[PDB]
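Crash report, auto-generated. Payload:
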Amino acid sequence: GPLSLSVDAFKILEDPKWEFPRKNLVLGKTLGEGEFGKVVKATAFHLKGRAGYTTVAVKMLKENASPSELRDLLSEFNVLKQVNHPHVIKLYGACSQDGPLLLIMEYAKYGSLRGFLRESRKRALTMGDLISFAWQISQGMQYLAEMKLVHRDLAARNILVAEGRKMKISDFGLSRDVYEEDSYVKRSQGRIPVKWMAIESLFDHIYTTQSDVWSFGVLLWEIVTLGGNPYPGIPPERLFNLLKTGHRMERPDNCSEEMYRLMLQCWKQEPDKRPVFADISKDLEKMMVKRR
Amino acid sequence: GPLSLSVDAFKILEDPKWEFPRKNLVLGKTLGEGEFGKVVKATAFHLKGRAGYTTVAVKMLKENASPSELRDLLSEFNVLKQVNHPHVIKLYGACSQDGPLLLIMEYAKYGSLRGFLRESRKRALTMGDLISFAWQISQGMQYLAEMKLVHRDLAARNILVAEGRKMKISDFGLSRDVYEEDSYVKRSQGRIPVKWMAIESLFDHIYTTQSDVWSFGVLLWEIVTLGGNPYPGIPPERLFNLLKTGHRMERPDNCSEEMYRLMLQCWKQEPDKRPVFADISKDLEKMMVKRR
Ligand SMILES: NC(=O)c1ccc(-c2cnn3ccc(NCc4cccnc4)nc23)cc1
Ligand SMILES: NC(=O)c1ccc(-c2cnn3ccc(NCc4cccnc4)nc23)cc1
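Recovered output after restart:
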């Protein structure tokens, strides 16, 4: 089937550019396990012409991996090979011979944005620090949108915080190319959490840059609430009726009228009425210069 | 889409037979979290005409549930409503109004068969105890096969051990009706662990009772090894080439020639060359009466 073809094609791919010797890679503690698979902290000797050990993250299959998970790992390798932007996490290489498939990723010191924000208050962050975070993520998404990639899984848990508090978009297992159609559509049910999905993704299984814009809005709410839980205390099965009847999340505490206006615009029923990421970045730039 | 229809249809379904009052249900400790969702230990007042509290398991959505997980919970409710066999875990009811979807299940004291076996040795189990376990599971599968249900996810982790060491087949989130076609086929990649999938499921996405027979064979190996890890130390992406080139798991230690013959028969390339569950039960009955 489609996966057997990908596995065989990948297993014979003689790509010295990406192939890294397993013996030069040492694995350490688990950083996280979820839908994104298993991520461990690791160190790589003589990675990408750099003398000595480089600290890296290694993504790999969890115990008892399904075709779904294997397909997502190979998909991510294929996407990240072609991506290069300071606000997207980098692939450095892979080990695909004489052991499990390992993807070697750029290390982000502070871990997930959700973790970073929940650890903090107002660590002390200003509204300007938050607008900066959102802007950095908007820039990366503008680049991905230009590359005709829909991430599909934009959320605070899928943003990494690297040295200098630099946002890195992460978890490309569900990301899809849309050069052909400017939309990605699947018959089967998606694996993106309901509470981050656009109304047209949830009802009609339609994924576009503008459904990424919806997700960014939920991410904005997560950022403004310092890692709040979206639609708190509302079961996910209620999101069908809630969204369809025109309901959205209330303006949260410590949120400007302008900032909440941006969230609401990201959650317009009609995808074409939503801003594009370039607009979002301009709206965030404007908030920054006006002062926090 | 298909899920919005299921959610709305289910949310208006006036089924007093299955609907249980939320106020009569008290949730306790988490028993497990995985692909099957979240399962908690609980107690139900005046369940199914029984006076007082009954100890039960409650299945519910994990944090940040996807459409996939919600679809699987509703699918399981629909399947277990129509199933009744002493070696299949029972649905007792559901809470679907004024809070999250909760499925109320029969409680199995000893938890997973994988856990039970790994906890034990030769707790002391005989080859007769193991053949009994396998037989009980074969009987339940014969009943499901007759009902035109393909489980798809048969493994030691998805068998429960109840009072009297009675096997209960569990985790019906991935089970599908095949009355129409005698096969279930999906375009997208499945969420069954690779190492339990039949070769025709893995390559061609074809699920039948005979692919359940393949899975039962891996379960037999799990039972005989007291919860071993199938194809140990072999990455799941190697299973394509391994299975296609005619390789299968070696006869494990403390396994009869007859018992291993049954495993191999369950893993024949050609589904029609595999035994049916009725045959499997007869082969296990024969081993029992001959003596352990
Ligand atoms: N391509 C990828 O998906 C990916 C994922 C994670 C990493 C990664 C790099 N440094 N680092 C530090 C902590 C950490 N904690 C688990 C986590 C957090 C957020 C999101 N996922 C996992 N992860 C990391 C790098 C790449
Ligand atoms: N319909 C269902 O899928 C289901 C699942 C689990 C239960 C359930 C009943 N008693 N009990 C005790 C322990 C336990 N531990 C988690 C576990 C173990 C095996 C498999 N899954 C979860 N689970 C249970 C009942 C029904």
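Post-recovery validation: The radius of gyration of chain B is 19 Å.
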